[PDB]
Design a binder for this molecule. Structure first.
Ligand code: ANP
Ligand code: CA
Length: 378
């Protein structure tokens, strides 16, 4: 049974497999190459992935996400305390360990963060198995470079309870390098910058590779900056526009807002390829259909300060690593948000026209590298 590579993201997960020298990123039941890290509990079932995310608008208290932010931490953890104040689901304390509390089939139940992740891990496992036509046992799971021993332990545990023989836990930036082959022995030292901007986190890693051996020289970023923040800006923009056109503030209606955001995230993806996209939502508030559009120019304008500030963590990374722009040999893009044109322009201008590594879908790069690593480990 082939060993697979799994990227367990805060917002999206991806699974790949190495077969015949080639790596294949496995698409799910809905045909997506990445599946949301969402779990939802209802009166009749346990929904995982797209099915879960597709119903969050009508089950905010029983649809769990962001488990990667909980995994391996304590309830008393300041991070946990801050974050929990924004999740629409319950987080309880159990002997100092944080636990998610939801209502499943009328009964009230709670789960440890690692149990939630194992649910996502199981979905990936079945996605692979469905594709491969064989049971997947061995696997390599990826984790941010800054995860401590507890967080790594928890990620490993989530895997074992999902029935996966976790061959190894390797850092995400290292996985991204291997995907590009930046680990090949060339008889010299090589500094690589991993620019990872996914759904909810931004990480900048500077790796040094000497004889196939990696050395994370520095890291920086923002655990609270990602594609979701860009969507927010569009939502606020459209709320104002709806109010401007219909004198009706839809902010209070949580269903209206959640449906609008879904339309925005979709428009955003389209903007990375086209110059403008349309927002077509039937009866957003009351019976008023919201039909409008946005241009890429307007979109860039809405997030100008966010995009620009993305360069601060990069400068900090160089500073700490004790390297200048000139010294970094390779720059690889990771995360679905790196598909945004203005962000690609921004990074190149910073690195004075230097070419960016981006032939492998940025949101599949981590999975891609893990798959190769799984293959060699098997
Ligand atoms: N074409 C696109 N243009 C812009 N953003 C995109 C595009 N395709 C996907 N995304 C965004 O990329 C994000 C998904 O990133 P991805 O790297 O798959 O997440 P992840 O691994 O969960 N990362 P993180 O959330 O940081 O742990 C969401 O905010 C998507 O809207
Ligand atoms: Ca990541």
């Amino acid at each position: 049974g082939p060993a697979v590579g799994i990227d367990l993201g805060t917002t999206y997960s991806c699974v790949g497999v190495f077969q015949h020298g080639k790596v294949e990123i496995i698409a799910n039941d809905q045909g997506n190459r990445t599946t949301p890290s969402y779990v939802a509990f209802t009166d009749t079932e346990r929904l995982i992935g797209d099915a879960a995310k597709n119903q969050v608008a009508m089950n905010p208290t029983n649809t769990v996400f962001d488990a990667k932010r909980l995994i391996g931490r304590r309830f008393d953890d300041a991070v946990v305390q801050s974050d929990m104040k924004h999740w629409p689901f319950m987080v309880v304390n159990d002997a100092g360990r944080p636990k998610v509390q939801v209502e499943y089939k009328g009964e009230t139940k709670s789960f440890y963060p690692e149990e939630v992740s194992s649910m996502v891990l199981t979905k990936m496992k079945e996605i692979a198995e469905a594709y491969l036509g064989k049971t997947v046992t061995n696997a390599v799971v990826t984790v941010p470079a800054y995860f401590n021993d507890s967080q790594r332990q928890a990620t490993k545990d989530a895997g074992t309870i999902a029935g996966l023989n976790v061959l190894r836990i390797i850092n995400e930036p290292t996985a991204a390098a291997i995907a590009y082959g930046l680990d090949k022995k060339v008889g010299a030292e090589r500094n690589v910058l991993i620019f990872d901007l996914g759904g909810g986190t931004f990480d900048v890693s500077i790796l040094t590779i000497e004889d196939g051996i990696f050395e994370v020289k520095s890291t920086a970023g923002d655990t609270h900056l990602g594609g979701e923040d860009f969507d927010n800006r569009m939502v606020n923009h459209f709320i104002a526009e709806f109010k401007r056109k219909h004198k009706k503030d839809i902010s209070e209606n949580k269903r209206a807002v959640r449906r609008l955001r879904t339309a925005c995230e979709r428009a955003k993806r389209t903007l990375s390829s086209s110059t403008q996209a349309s927002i077509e939502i039937d009866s957003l508030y009351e019976g008023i259909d919201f039909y409008t559009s946005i241009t890429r120019a307007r979109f860039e304008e809405l997030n100008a300060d966010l995009f620009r500030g993305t360069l601060d963590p990069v400068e900090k990374a160089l500073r700490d690593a004790k390297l200048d722009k000139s010294q970094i040999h390779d720059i690889v893009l990771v995360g679905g948000s790196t598909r945004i044109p203005k962000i690609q322009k921004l990074l190149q201008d910073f690195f004075n026209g230097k070419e960016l590594n981006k032939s492998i879908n940025p949101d599949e790069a981590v999975a891609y590298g893990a798959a190769v690593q799984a293959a060699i480990l098997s």
